[PDB]
Write a protein that binds this ligand. Structure first.
Ligand SMILES: [Mg+2]
Ligand SMILES: [Mg+2]
Ligand SMILES: [Mg+2]
Ligand SMILES: [Mg+2]
Ligand SMILES: [Mg+2]
Ligand SMILES: [Mg+2]
Ligand SMILES: [Mg+2]
Ligand SMILES: [Mg+2]
Ligand SMILES: [Mg+2]
Ligand SMILES: [Mg+2]
Ligand SMILES: [Mg+2]
Ligand SMILES: [Mg+2]
Ligand SMILES: [Mg+2]
Ligand SMILES: [Mg+2]
Ligand SMILES: [Mg+2]
Ligand SMILES: [Mg+2]
Ligand SMILES: [Mg+2]
Ligand SMILES: [Mg+2]
Ligand SMILES: [Mg+2]
Ligand SMILES: [Mg+2]
Ligand SMILES: [Mg+2]
Ligand SMILES: [Mg+2]
Ligand SMILES: [Mg+2]
Ligand SMILES: [Mg+2]
Ligand SMILES: [Mg+2]
Ligand SMILES: [Mg+2]
Ligand SMILES: [Mg+2]
Ligand SMILES: [Mg+2]
Ligand SMILES: [Mg+2]
Ligand SMILES: [Mg+2]
Ligand SMILES: [Mg+2]
Ligand SMILES: [Mg+2]
Ligand SMILES: [Mg+2]
Ligand SMILES: [Mg+2]
Ligand SMILES: [Mg+2]
Ligand SMILES: [Mg+2]
Ligand SMILES: [Mg+2]
Ligand SMILES: [Mg+2]
Ligand SMILES: [Mg+2]
Ligand SMILES: [Mg+2]
Ligand SMILES: [Mg+2]
Ligand SMILES: [Mg+2]
Ligand SMILES: [Mg+2]
Ligand SMILES: [Mg+2]
Ligand SMILES: [Mg+2]
Ligand SMILES: [Mg+2]
Ligand SMILES: [Mg+2]
Ligand SMILES: [Mg+2]
Ligand SMILES: [Mg+2]
Ligand SMILES: [Mg+2]
Ligand SMILES: [Mg+2]
Ligand SMILES: [Mg+2]
Ligand SMILES: [Mg+2]
Ligand SMILES: [Mg+2]
Ligand SMILES: [Mg+2]
Ligand SMILES: [Mg+2]
Ligand SMILES: [Mg+2]
Ligand SMILES: [Mg+2]
Ligand SMILES: [Mg+2]
Ligand SMILES: [Mg+2]
Ligand SMILES: [Mg+2]
Ligand SMILES: [Mg+2]
Ligand SMILES: [Mg+2]
Ligand SMILES: [Mg+2]
Ligand SMILES: [Mg+2]
Ligand SMILES: [Mg+2]
Ligand SMILES: [Mg+2]
Ligand SMILES: [Mg+2]
Ligand SMILES: [Mg+2]
Ligand SMILES: [Mg+2]
Ligand SMILES: [Mg+2]
Ligand SMILES: [Mg+2]
Ligand SMILES: [Mg+2]
Ligand SMILES: [Mg+2]
Ligand SMILES: [Mg+2]
Ligand SMILES: [Mg+2]
Ligand SMILES: [Mg+2]
Ligand SMILES: [Mg+2]
Ligand SMILES: [Mg+2]
Ligand SMILES: [Mg+2]
Ligand SMILES: [Mg+2]
Ligand SMILES: [Mg+2]
Ligand SMILES: [Mg+2]
Ligand SMILES: [Mg+2]
Ligand SMILES: [Mg+2]
Ligand SMILES: [Mg+2]
Ligand SMILES: [Mg+2]
Ligand SMILES: [Mg+2]
Ligand SMILES: [Mg+2]
Ligand SMILES: [Mg+2]
Ligand SMILES: [Mg+2]
Ligand SMILES: [Mg+2]
Ligand SMILES: [Mg+2]
Ligand SMILES: [Mg+2]
Ligand SMILES: [Mg+2]
Ligand SMILES: [Mg+2]
Ligand SMILES: [Mg+2]
Ligand SMILES: [Mg+2]
Ligand SMILES: [Mg+2]
Ligand SMILES: [Mg+2]
Ligand SMILES: [Mg+2]
Ligand SMILES: [Mg+2]
Ligand SMILES: [Mg+2]
Ligand SMILES: [Mg+2]
Ligand SMILES: [Mg+2]
Ligand SMILES: [Mg+2]
Ligand SMILES: [Mg+2]
Ligand SMILES: [Mg+2]
Ligand SMILES: [Mg+2]
Ligand SMILES: [Mg+2]
Ligand SMILES: [Mg+2]
Ligand SMILES: [Mg+2]
Ligand SMILES: [Mg+2]
Ligand SMILES: [Mg+2]
Ligand SMILES: [Mg+2]
Ligand SMILES: [Mg+2]
Ligand SMILES: [Mg+2]
Ligand SMILES: [Mg+2]
Ligand SMILES: [Mg+2]
Ligand SMILES: [Mg+2]
Ligand SMILES: [Mg+2]
Ligand SMILES: [Mg+2]
Ligand SMILES: [Mg+2]
Ligand SMILES: [Mg+2]
Ligand SMILES: [Mg+2]
Ligand SMILES: [Mg+2]
Lengths: 50, 252, 52, 86, 112
RNA sequence: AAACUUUCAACAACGGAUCUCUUGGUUCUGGCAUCGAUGAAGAACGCAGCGAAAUGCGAUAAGUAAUGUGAAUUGCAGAAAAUCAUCGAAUCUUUGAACGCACAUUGCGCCCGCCGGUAUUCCGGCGGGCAUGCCUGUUCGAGCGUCAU
RNA sequence: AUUAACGAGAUUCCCACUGUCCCUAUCUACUAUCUAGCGAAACCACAGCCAAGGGAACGGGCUUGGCAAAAUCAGCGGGGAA
RNA sequence: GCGUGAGCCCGGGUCGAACGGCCUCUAGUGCAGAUCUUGGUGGUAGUAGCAAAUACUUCAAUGAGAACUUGAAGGACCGAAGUGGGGAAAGGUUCCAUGUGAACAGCGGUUGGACAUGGGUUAGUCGAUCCUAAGCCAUAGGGAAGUUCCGUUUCAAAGGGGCACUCGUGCCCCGUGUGGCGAAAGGGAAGCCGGUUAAUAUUCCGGCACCUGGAUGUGGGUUUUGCGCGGCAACGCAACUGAACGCGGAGACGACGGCGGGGGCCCCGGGCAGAGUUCUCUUUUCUUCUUAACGGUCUAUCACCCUGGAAACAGUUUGUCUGGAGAUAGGGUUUAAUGGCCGGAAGAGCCCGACACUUCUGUCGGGUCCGGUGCGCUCUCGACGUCCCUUGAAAAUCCGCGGGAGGGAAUAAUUCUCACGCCAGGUCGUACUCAUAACCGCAGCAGGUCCCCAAGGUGAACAGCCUCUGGUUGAUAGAACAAUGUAGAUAAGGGAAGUCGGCAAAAUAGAUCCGUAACUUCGGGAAAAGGAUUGGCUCUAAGGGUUGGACAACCAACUUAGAACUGGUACGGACAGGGGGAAUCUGACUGUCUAAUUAAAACAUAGCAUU
RNA sequence: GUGAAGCCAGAGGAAACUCUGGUGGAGGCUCGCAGCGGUUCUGACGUGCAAAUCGAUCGUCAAAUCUGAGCAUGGGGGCGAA
RNA sequence: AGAGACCGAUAGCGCACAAGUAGAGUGAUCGAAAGAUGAAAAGCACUUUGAAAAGAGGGUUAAAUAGCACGUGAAAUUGUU
């Protein structure tokens, strides 16, 4: 809702900041195995528990 | 089987009495020096309706003998009491309606209300609408007083016990039929969660001793012993007799 | 707001008439500090803030 | 019941706990279903070995406890290497 | 006949969300949120409204002057004047009766 | 006779079996005894030139000091060691047994001191404090509980 | 036992009414249908024409007969003891 | 090729790093089944199907590609209990701009709540924060082996006010109390208008205000042995001292009914400006014509005061009621603006009209009015009234008073609630959706989910039906029209012969006027049963207010009744809208339950009786 | 829609209380929209839009009416117009 | 810290991997799948067709039928001949 607590707002901020694809230069490092962001979350797919 | 409704009622929870609209308990003044030795004068400010109580209450203001403040009490209103009336409480108070006197200073044959079982308890007996306690007799050497209760019982209380001269207001409240489930509901909605009441024979055996069966029947004697276990006391507890009362009863 | 005003005064010799604040969805605080009418925000930004 | 009743689900039995961080703090009882907050002792039961090991020591950072073995190995000594700037 | 909306986050008609309708100089119909009506102070004896005192919310009386909050006589506020006159007459009569009763008791019970 | 179905074979698909591998498990054995109010375990939020996670760290934030080694780090950029080992000096946000009272609020207080606004009283900034049970001691007290003048 | 009023309660009859029926016919929309695109599931020992016989006493297969011609589409509810 | 066989060996291909024979030792050692476990893959099969919510069409642009992108035009729907405009919970970035391969949007897709890169939420006045409610958790104590249980003021030594020094620490009074959490709908200090962005605005900008707290000024007032003056009074005036202690008020309260006032909306008339129509007619149809908070001023029912003394009782409401406890009447005081005028404020907004121009700049003219109406709708206020064996929160906070403690320079301050003036007002939330796609139902699901505003016509009517503003035109499409269907109907004559059974359907239906049985708890039954009328047009009558001088004139809506004429013998012309009667069983009635097979005669109920 | 008390006026009679016009606006009254519910079609659907929905028809609709948030009762326990 | 007549990616701990992770549930709790190009990215320059994805040539390598759907590459099932 528009009414939010500071804690809830902060956690939403953290989720928004984590919602991104991985950097491209990561895949160029030696020994890299990360192909894509496996913890990607979408507001329509997976509900975050507050 | 289950825990039956009568057993559940003692837990509290949803069966606790409603108290929001009740402003103060109906009690006499604390028994003090003025009431013990002489009298004290109070002024009736209002006659109020107390939800859940058939009888009206009287708000009476007194002066503090020891401080500049003034003290408002809540008495059970005796019928005939009115706003702006002076009432007097004490040993030497006059014998008029609404005055609070010890039973020692009251002649035999007068009716009182909110009679104390023991002096200083601020009233226990005959506090319901249309009810009163009769002063049957005195025993000054023993310092006691025989009284007759609304139920017809005879009791002996110390003569120092106090009572309000007259009869509790509220008249014959039970003289008119409730006539409607809604009116019964409104009556009990400010008292308790006890209405409506389902019959035990309409239940299942898991729910009540009267249980089920292919016909609605108790199936065993409904009179239950005085020393039956909790959960068994459903029906007529310790009934001396049953059936229609067809004459006068020796007990009283 | 008091800390922001004092910090601006100490760090840039900037005097403000009022400061509004919000917290952005990214979690950081954004402050709109209105300067006094006698000081020009364009010159302040050009000379001290590197903004053009 | 079922689909029609699932539409009335817009309240919250549990919120976020300050001690364990899970959404297991009963909003009315004010007690955490996971860590037992606000009780002093952390809620833990021997009939759930999985639950015990999900939060046993070593599942977090160990900000202080990880440095104890080295200090013990060197004897909880104090001071500086004989011949150190400062 | 344009339709209006609440201007605050409270969407319910809860005896504190009182609104009235206004027309703005911009030419459009709008809602104005208004407080509860003031209430006239009552007499402490008879309970009728007291003449000469404005009906305001309780906090509003702290910002108006004393002469507007009271009337210039004994028990100016909180009593209605008729009650004050009754008090004066009653007090005088009780003191007179007390004086004559004490003099009568002294003259007729302590004459020996 | 084609088509279709089926059978057989070659090649091509689908799928991930088999073989080989293994910075991982599992079991046994040996050595050791070291958490926390000097704030633990755990949780939250942040910190990189370019990072979401994992790892590391705490506004001194992919780390500081110190010691040892002795020329890197590396995906790109950059610069004049190191994402090195060791580790005795420090820092260590909000929390949490969690401690001014609370907390579903980044809520509401009190005390001491300093610096400003005309200021012992109000406001603002900064720093240090204010939980409970119990022990020893200190000081101030209560009680015709009691002792002498 | 009776009972005015009330009843999405059970029952019988009467008037009105009508496709419930004699006895069916016709019209409209949306399907079904054909096309483009997209595109499952249930189920599946192997499979799938019958008659009689015997048989675990009701066979698709066994015995003896009838027979028996590619590949198919829309319906259908006898059988598959579906 | 060998072996009866389990198997063993070899040839060819692929492939890339280990492996085998013999004798002993060892075991997690041999699979077709276990509705076996995990994983993968078939026939079915290009099959079932993608059919609720009325619906699309033309041209153009874009693009490789257009039914489901966009522009314009047309045709439609939602039809103010909306498919409209905003909120609460819940979500969390879905909001805005730019770009876009794949995946997703059960068809497509140039489009998207998708993907990618960047932005976006501004408060002393709106909320939280403060208060208390139901309730929860401490404390003192008491239980419990203990985790802990009760306890919330209770078997407790439980606090807050003032004066005095160079300096904090010297005293003097009061005391019965002595915690916290708990409402974004309860209580509550204070902000309005205009403009502005891609996205925020009662928050930004401009103008104009308010509240709280703290400080000390200028003026004013009062006094100098003291703390204002006036009015018969109700009370008034710009202030016009006032500790403790106490009293009172406000906060602060139900449901319903008719009536009256006010705002807004609707409607009517005239005028102004623009637009539509104009074969013909229409002094025509439509739209605009606005005025905030905050203040000043004058009023506004109830009540209260003064004079006076009422029966031949009077005044008076739709209803009531009121009066020797003082009515009618006359004159006053006062609570109560969402009323009039004025400031704000025309400088704004809006509407027209005319001159500049790549842009930078728009600029300049004018106008922005007057009346009426009402069982109208909505909100609000007021005075009455009804109902209750129902009487319909608390606290924080603010104010008044009773009392009279202290203090108050005839030439100087003045314990001032008056005017003006000075300083400050922290923290968190603020985007967007709120739903046939932003929440919950595994999902972009015909379900579910708490509110606010609420136009015109018909009509009794937020009934149905049509329309305006606003919003949509989104639900895979094209063609054909077989059976069987689902949904919507119609049928000659008969009229329940069908069927367990009139299931389903049909018939009735509005309003006005007639008429209405048995039975009855006398209240009902009852809309019983039944019958007649209903359109259009042209008229007539009645039902009100104001002024003159019993009539005339002026003003204003509707409601009812009567008559003639007329056509299709039709008229509640769609929509809307009771079938009825004679009885039996049963439960008195209203009400409640097996969410998802049973709504009943079951439960409940009032009444009765017992303990 | 019906029209309970209370009230006004007029008719009779001798009384007492009869009657007739009005006024009024009571009732767990009634028709009926929204809401709430869920009777029948034993309709649609029945690998659905849906693990209970859809359509028509129905019950109730001013009070034992509907509903939000906060709070309480926790498994042999609760709650139950059963 | 050292070992084994142990297991060898459906085995061995649930986890050889950003595993008590992703995800489910109001919650207590429940809880996966998933290792291997090559010695070295040398991870295919350039031409051409295509709107693009890609294809065809060409290149790297010992090897591309080792091309990030990557060692080998079975069967079920499928296409062509
Ligand atoms: Mg039991
Ligand atoms: Mg009962
Ligand atoms: Mg039963
Ligand atoms: Mg039993
Ligand atoms: Mg028994
Ligand atoms: Mg029975
Ligand atoms: Mg028997
Ligand atoms: Mg803010
Ligand atoms: Mg609910
Ligand atoms: Mg604690
Ligand atoms: Mg962790
Ligand atoms: Mg063969
Ligand atoms: Mg493959
Ligand atoms: Mg292997
Ligand atoms: Mg720490
Ligand atoms: Mg401390
Ligand atoms: Mg401490
Ligand atoms: Mg709070
Ligand atoms: Mg403070
Ligand atoms: Mg200072
Ligand atoms: Mg300070
Ligand atoms: Mg501090
Ligand atoms: Mg000491
Ligand atoms: Mg002593
Ligand atoms: Mg009957
Ligand atoms: Mg078909
Ligand atoms: Mg097709
Ligand atoms: Mg087969
Ligand atoms: Mg056969
Ligand atoms: Mg046979
Ligand atoms: Mg046979
Ligand atoms: Mg067979
Ligand atoms: Mg044969
Ligand atoms: Mg054939
Ligand atoms: Mg069939
Ligand atoms: Mg068949
Ligand atoms: Mg079969
Ligand atoms: Mg190799
Ligand atoms: Mg085995
Ligand atoms: Mg097998
Ligand atoms: Mg076998
Ligand atoms: Mg399987
Ligand atoms: Mg399959
Ligand atoms: Mg098909
Ligand atoms: Mg279908
Ligand atoms: Mg179709
Ligand atoms: Mg459709
Ligand atoms: Mg083109
Ligand atoms: Mg379309
Ligand atoms: Mg329609
Ligand atoms: Mg329409
Ligand atoms: Mg409405
Ligand atoms: Mg909107
Ligand atoms: Mg909306
Ligand atoms: Mg909530
Ligand atoms: Mg968008
Ligand atoms: Mg685009
Ligand atoms: Mg698609
Ligand atoms: Mg496509
Ligand atoms: Mg696309
Ligand atoms: Mg394109
Ligand atoms: Mg996105
Ligand atoms: Mg406010
Ligand atoms: Mg606050
Ligand atoms: Mg408090
Ligand atoms: Mg407790
Ligand atoms: Mg104890
Ligand atoms: Mg609070
Ligand atoms: Mg509120
Ligand atoms: Mg402002
Ligand atoms: Mg401004
Ligand atoms: Mg001030
Ligand atoms: Mg002066
Ligand atoms: Mg209230
Ligand atoms: Mg106006
Ligand atoms: Mg209208
Ligand atoms: Mg007009
Ligand atoms: Mg004005
Ligand atoms: Mg008068
Ligand atoms: Mg003006
Ligand atoms: Mg002008
Ligand atoms: Mg309303
Ligand atoms: Mg009005
Ligand atoms: Mg908004
Ligand atoms: Mg969802
Ligand atoms: Mg829905
Ligand atoms: Mg209308
Ligand atoms: Mg009309
Ligand atoms: Mg209508
Ligand atoms: Mg819309
Ligand atoms: Mg569809
Ligand atoms: Mg049909
Ligand atoms: Mg016929
Ligand atoms: Mg016929
Ligand atoms: Mg007939
Ligand atoms: Mg028949
Ligand atoms: Mg028959
Ligand atoms: Mg029927
Ligand atoms: Mg019909
Ligand atoms: Mg009748
Ligand atoms: Mg009848
Ligand atoms: Mg009739
Ligand atoms: Mg006619
Ligand atoms: Mg008719
Ligand atoms: Mg009907
Ligand atoms: Mg019944
Ligand atoms: Mg119930
Ligand atoms: Mg059922
Ligand atoms: Mg069941
Ligand atoms: Mg049913
Ligand atoms: Mg009713
Ligand atoms: Mg419904
Ligand atoms: Mg059915
Ligand atoms: Mg079907
Ligand atoms: Mg239905
Ligand atoms: Mg039909
Ligand atoms: Mg494994
Ligand atoms: Mg595998
Ligand atoms: Mg596993
Ligand atoms: Mg979850
Ligand atoms: Mg592999
Ligand atoms: Mg090659
Ligand atoms: Mg190969
Ligand atoms: Mg290879
Ligand atoms: Mg391979
Ligand atoms: Mg094969």
């Amino acid at each position: 809702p528009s009414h939010k607590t500071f804690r809830i707002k902060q956690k939403l901020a953290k989720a928004q900041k984590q919602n991104r694809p991985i950097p491209q230069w990561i895949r160029l490092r030696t020994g890299n195995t990360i192909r894509y962001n496996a913890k990607r979350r979408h507001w329509r797919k997976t509900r975050l528990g507050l | 089987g289950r825990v039956i409704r009568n057993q559940r009622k003692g837990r509290g929870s949803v069966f606790t009495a409603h108290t929001r609209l009740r402003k103060a308990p109906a009690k006499f003044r604390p028994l003090d020096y003025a009431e013990r030795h002489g009298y004290i004068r109070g002024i009736v400010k209002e006659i109020i309706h107390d939800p859940g109580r058939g009888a009206p209450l009287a708000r009476v203001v007194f002066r503090s003998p020891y401080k500049y403040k003034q003290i408002t009490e809540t008495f059970i209103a005796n019928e005939g009491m009115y706003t702006g009336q002076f009432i007097y409480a004490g040993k030497n108070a006059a014998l008029t309606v609404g005055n609070i006197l010890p039973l020692s200073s009251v002649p035999e044959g007068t009716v009182v209300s909110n009679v104390e079982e023991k002096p200083g308890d601020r009233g226990a007996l005959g506090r319901t609408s249309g009810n009163y306690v009769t002063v049957v007799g005195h025993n000054p050497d023993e310092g006691k007083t025989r009284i007759k209760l609304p139920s017809g019982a005879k009791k002996v209380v110390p003569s120092s016990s106090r009572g309000m001269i007259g009869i509790v207001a509220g008249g014959g409240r039970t003289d008119k039929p409730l006539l409607k489930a809604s009116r019964a509901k409104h009556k009990f909605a400010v008292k308790r969660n006890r209405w409506p009441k389902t019959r035990g024979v309409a239940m299942n055996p898991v729910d009540h001793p009267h249980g089920g069966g292919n016909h609605q029947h108790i199936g065993k004697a409904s009179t239950i012993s005085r020393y039956a276990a909790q959960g068994q006391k459903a029906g007529l507890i310790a009934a001396r007799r049953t059936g229609l009362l067809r004459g006068t009863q020796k007990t009283k | 707001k008091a800390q922001i005003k004092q910090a601006l005064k100490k760090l840039y010799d900037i005097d403000t008439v009022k400061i509004n604040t919000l917290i952005r969805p990214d979690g950081t605080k954004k402050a709109f500090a209105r300067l006094t009418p006698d000081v020009d925000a364009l010159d302040i930004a050009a000379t001290k803030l590197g903004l053009v | 019941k079922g689909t029609s009743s699932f539409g009335k689900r817009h309240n919250k039995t549990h919120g976020l706990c300050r001690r364990c961080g899970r959404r297991s703090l009963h909003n009315q009882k004010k007690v955490c279903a996971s860590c037992g907050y606000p009780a002093a002792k952390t809620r833990k039961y021997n009939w759930s070995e999985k639950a015990k090991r999900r939060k046993v020591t070593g599942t977090g950072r160990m900000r202080y406890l990880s440095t104890v073995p080295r200090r013990f190995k060197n004897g909880f000594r104090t001071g500086v290497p004989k011949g150190a700037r400062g | 006949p344009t339709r209006v909306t609440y201007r605050r986050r409270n969407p319910y008609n809860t005896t504190s969300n009182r609104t009235r309708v206004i027309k703005t100089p911009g030419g459009q119909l709008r809602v104005l949120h208004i407080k509860k009506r003031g209430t006239a102070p009552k007499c402490g004896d008879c309970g009728i409204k007291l003449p000469g005192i404005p009906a305001l919310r309780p906090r509003e009386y702290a910002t108006i002057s004393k002469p507007k909050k009271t009337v210039q006589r004994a028990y100016g506020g909180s009593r209605c004047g008729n009650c004050v006159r009754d008090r004066i007459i009653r007090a005088f009569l009780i003191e007179e009766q007390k004086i004559v009763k004490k003099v009568l008791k002294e003259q007729s019970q302590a004459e020996k």
